[PDB]
Structures are given as C-alpha cells and as structure tokens.
Amino acid sequence: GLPWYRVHTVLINDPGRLIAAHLMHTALVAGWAGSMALYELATFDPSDPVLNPMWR
Amino acid sequence: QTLTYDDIVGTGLANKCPTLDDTARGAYPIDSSQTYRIARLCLQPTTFLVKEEPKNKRQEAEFVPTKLVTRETTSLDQIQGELKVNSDGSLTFVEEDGIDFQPVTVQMAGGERIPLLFTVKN
Ligand code: CLA
Ligand code: CLA
Numbered sequence: 785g786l787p788w789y790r791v792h793t794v795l796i797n798d799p800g801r802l803i804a805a806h807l808m809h810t811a812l813v814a815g816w817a818g819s820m821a822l823y824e825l826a827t828f829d830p831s832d833p834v835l836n837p838m839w840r
Numbered sequence: 841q842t843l844t845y846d847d848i849v850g851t852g853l854a855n856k857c858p859t860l861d862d863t864a865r866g867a868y869p870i871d872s873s874q875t876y877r878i879a880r881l882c883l884q885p886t887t888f889l890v891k892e893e894p895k896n897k898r899q900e901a902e903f904v905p906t907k908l909v910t911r912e913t914t915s916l917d918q919i920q921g922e923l924k925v926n927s928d929g930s931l932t933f934v935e936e937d938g939i940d941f942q943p944v945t946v947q948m949a950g951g952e953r954i955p956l957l958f959t960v961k962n
C-alpha cells in the first residue's frame with residue numbers, strides 16, 4: 785500500500801476532499817489561535833505596562 | 841404629591857437621597873440660644889474610587905474607578921444626631937444613630953474585588 789509518508793497523496797485528484805483537508809487545517813489553526821489567546825489571558829498580568837509589559 | 845411604599849418598591853428610588861429644587865438657594869437661620877438636631881441625614885454614594893497600589897513607590901498612586909457589584913444597597917440613611925452651636929458660632933454634628941453603614945463590594949479593572957464598610961459611624 786502507500787508508505788506512511790505518502791498517505792495524504794490520496795487527495796491529489798479529489799478536489800472536494802482536498803478542500804475538506806484544507807478546511808480541517810484552517811479549523812486547527814484558528815482553534816490554536818483562540819486557545820493560545822485564552823491561555824495568555826489566563827496568565828497575563830495587566831497591572832504594570834511599565835516594568836511588566838506583555839513581552840516580559 | 842407623595843409616594844407610598846407600593847409606588848417606590850423595586851424602582852431603585854429607596855436607595856436615593858431626597859433632592860431639593862434648583863429654587864432652593866436660601867438661608868436657614870441659626871439662633872445660638874436654640875438647640876438643634878439633624879433629624880435625617882442621608883448619603884447616596886454615586887462613585888467609589890480605590891487607590892491603586894504601585895510597585896513603583898516612585899510617583900503617587902491614583903484613585904481609580906471601580907464597578908459596584910452589590911447593587912442598590914449602598915446608601916446611609918435615617919441618621920440622626922445633635923447639631924451643637926459652638927461658642928465661636930461654628931456648628932458640630934454629633935452622629936447618634938441610624939442606618940450608618942453599608943457593606944459594599946466594588947470591582948477593579950481586571951477583577952479584584954474590594955469590599956468595604958462604607959460608613960459615618962460616630
Ligand atoms: C491537519 C492535520 C491533518 C488532516 C486534515 C489529515 C487528513 C487525512 N489523513 Mg492524515 N495525519 C496527520 C494530520 C492530518 N491528516 C498527522 C499529524 C498524522 C500522523 C499521526 C497523520 C497520519 C495519517 C495516516 C496514517 C492516515 C492519514 C489519512 C488521512 C485522511 C483520512 C483521515 C485519517 O485517517 O486521519 C488519521 C487520524 C489522525 C492522523 C489523528 C491525528 C493524531 C493527533 C495528534 C491526535 C489529536 C487528538 C487531540 C485533538 C490532541 C491530542 C494531543 C496531546 C496533548 C495528547 C485525510 C486526508 C489516512 C489515509 O487517507 O491514507 C491513505 C491514513 O491512513 N493521516
Ligand atoms: C503547505 C505546505 C506543504 C504541503 C501541503 C505538503 C504536502 C505534501 N507533501 Mg510536502 N513538504 C513541505 C511542505 C508541504 N508538503 C515542507 C516544508 C517539507 C520539508 C519539511 C516537505 C517535504 C516533503 C517530503 C520529503 C515529502 C512530502 C510529501 C508530501 C505529500 C504527502 C504528505 C504526507 O502524506 O505526509 C504524511 C505525514 C505524516 C503521516 C506525519 C508527518 C509528521 C511530522 C514529520 C512531524 C509532525 C508535524 C506537525 C504535526 C505539524 C505542525 C506543522 C507546522 C509547525 C508547519 C503531500 C502532497 C511526500 C511525497 O511527495 O509523496 C509522494 C514526501 O515524500 N513533503
């Protein structure tokens with residue numbers, strides 16, 4: 785069968801499933817962004833933008 | 841003219857002090873031979889400010905605005921006491937009794953809740 789490093793090649797001639805894979809990728813990236821921002825809000829201390837800004 | 845409990849109940853007006861007309865710019869004579877009292881003192885807070893506490897200790901901390909979270913339960917009222925006329929013609933109010941405190945919780949930016957006993961006791 786297909787070697788492990790070629791599994792996604794099944795999409796090359798299947799535009800609908802390629803779009804589905806792409807949709808999944810974008811869902812994952814956007815969920816990362818939402819999750820990342822929530823984790824940063826759970827940890828960020830806003831009380832000192834002078835000596836404790838976001839980049840510290 | 842005058843409101844009953846049923847007119848007031850649940851409106852918020854019970855937590856408000858009485859107001860006077862813009863017309864009320866008069867003068868109330870004090871006869872220094874007469875004794876006086878305050879029969880009703882009412883205090884309706886409209887803003888609570890809390891002094892932020894810096895790490896800086898350089899530059900003075902400001903008083904910042906806060907959000908009231910305990911609803912219309914903040915005013916002091918039905919307070920009474922003697923209004924003394926002093927020998928130099930100054931008046932001194934000596935609080936005796938009344939609804940002279942309210943626990944109040946206000947919330948700062950970012951969530952810190954600051955309870956206080958808002959009061960004029962004694
Ligand atoms: C954007 C990511 C993504 C997308 C959209 C796809 C989509 C596809 N894959 Mg690929 N794949 C991926 C990443 C992805 N894969 C990764 C990271 C691996 C290595 C694990 C694989 C290995 C793989 C194999 C071996 C096969 C496919 C196959 C397929 C097709 C059918 C679905 C399937 O069987 O998935 C497989 C199911 C997964 C890959 C689950 C991913 C494992 C993650 C890490 C678990 C996530 C759970 C949770 C949210 C997070 C836990 C993290 C941790 C803190 C514990 C489809 C085209 C099949 C096929 O069509 O081949 C011809 C197939 O046999 N994929
Ligand atoms: C848009 C970017 C992109 C896309 C859509 C693809 C898509 C494809 N690649 Mg290419 N490729 C890319 C960039 C990309 N590649 C990059 C940057 C490199 C160098 C790293 C490669 C090097 C490469 C090789 C050497 C091969 C492909 C192959 C393939 C095909 C099969 C992939 C597969 O089944 O893996 C299945 C993968 C797994 C089951 C697991 C991989 C797990 C990795 C190593 C670790 C986990 C990654 C983590 C989940 C992802 C976060 C990503 C983010 C940080 C970027 C498919 C057409 C294969 C081919 O041509 O088939 C004929 C092939 O041999 N790619």
Ligand code: CLA
Nearest residue numbers: 798799800801802803804805806807808809810811813814
């Ligand atoms: C006017 C026609 C039109 C428009 C507006 C688009 C727009 C888009 N196409 Mg292209 N496409 C078109 C014609 C069009 N396409 C034609 C005729 C073909 C040949 C059939 C393709 C083949 C094609 C492929 C093969 C792919 C795209 C993808 C994309 C998207 C990539 C950006 C993205 O996902 O952002 C993120 C998305 C958003 C911020 C959401 C946008 C809001 C959506 C679109 C509303 C959904 C409702 C709508 C009625 C459903 C169908 C929309 C459809 C017309 C695109 C984007 C929505 C890629 C994609 O889908 O990846 C996920 C992808 O893989 N297109």
Ligand code: CLA
Nearest residue numbers: 789790791792793805808809810811812813814815816817
């Ligand atoms: C420009 C931005 C960008 C681009 C071009 C890509 C491109 C890619 N992404 Mg996506 N990704 C992005 C941003 C991006 N990503 C962001 C911001 C997130 C949120 C964190 C993700 C989350 C994400 C997930 C969860 C997955 C992808 C996967 C993929 C691959 C799907 C095609 C494929 O089959 O590859 C075949 C695989 C390769 C060609 C190898 C890529 C090797 C990368 C470049 C370096 C990984 C190196 C190292 C071994 C990582 C080990 C991690 C370990 C320490 C845990 C492709 C290389 C999917 C994938 O890799 O499936 C196998 C996958 O599961 N991405």
Ligand SMILES: CCCCCCCCCCCCCCCC(=O)OC[C@H](COP(=O)(O)OC[C@@H](O)CO)OC(=O)CCCCCCCCCCCCCCC
Nearest residue numbers: 785786787788789790791792793808809811812813815816
């Ligand atoms: C965030 C989400 C994260 C989830 C992702 C997790 C999935 C990651 C999967 C990675 C594993 C892939 C390894 C497959 C390994 C594997 O299948 O190898 C054998 C494989 C042979 O392929 P063939 O084409 O012969 O196909 C046979 C098929 O049966 C394979 O599917 O070759 C490759 O895969 C090419 C690249 C690997 C070559 C690596 C060899 C390493 C040598 C040893 C090094 C250590 C010793 C060093 C000493 C100094």
Ligand SMILES: CCCCCCCCCCCCCCCC(=O)OC[C@H](COP(=O)(O)OC[C@@H](O)CO)OC(=O)CCCCCCCCCCCCCCC
Nearest residue numbers: 785786787788789790791792793794795796805809812816
């Ligand atoms: C599917 C693609 C994945 C590629 C990832 C490569 C990253 C390395 C950076 C670039 C150097 C490339 C030199 C390749 C040399 C080259 O030209 O390769 C091309 C080769 C495919 O070539 P062929 O199609 O000719 O197949 C040759 C096979 O038949 C074996 O003989 O690609 C692979 O073998 C893909 C697998 C490499 C996998 C490497 C190990 C990944 C381990 C990940 C550990 C993850 C831990 C996760 C923890 C949660």
Ligand SMILES: CCCCCCCCCCCCO[C@@H]1O[C@H](CO)[C@@H](O[C@H]2O[C@H](CO)[C@@H](O)[C@H](O)[C@H]2O)[C@H](O)[C@H]1O
Nearest residue numbers: 818819821822823824825826827828829950951952953
């Ligand atoms: C979209 C669906 C998913 C939504 C759910 C995910 C929510 C994540 C939101 C993060 C923002 C809230 O972040 C959270 O805030 C409070 C208030 O400072 C912190 O709480 C901390 O300080 C407060 C106030 O002194 C203490 O009473 C508390 O015990 C202590 O843990 C949390 O440690 C922090 O992690």
Ligand SMILES: CCCCCCCS[C@@H]1O[C@H](CO)[C@@H](O)[C@H](O)[C@H]1O
Nearest residue numbers: 822825826828830948949950951952
């Ligand atoms: C998508 C909905 C996420 C849920 C949001 C939680 C409320 S918002 C949250 O409030 C905390 C307390 O006031 C703050 O300390 C923190 O900075 C703020 O991000």
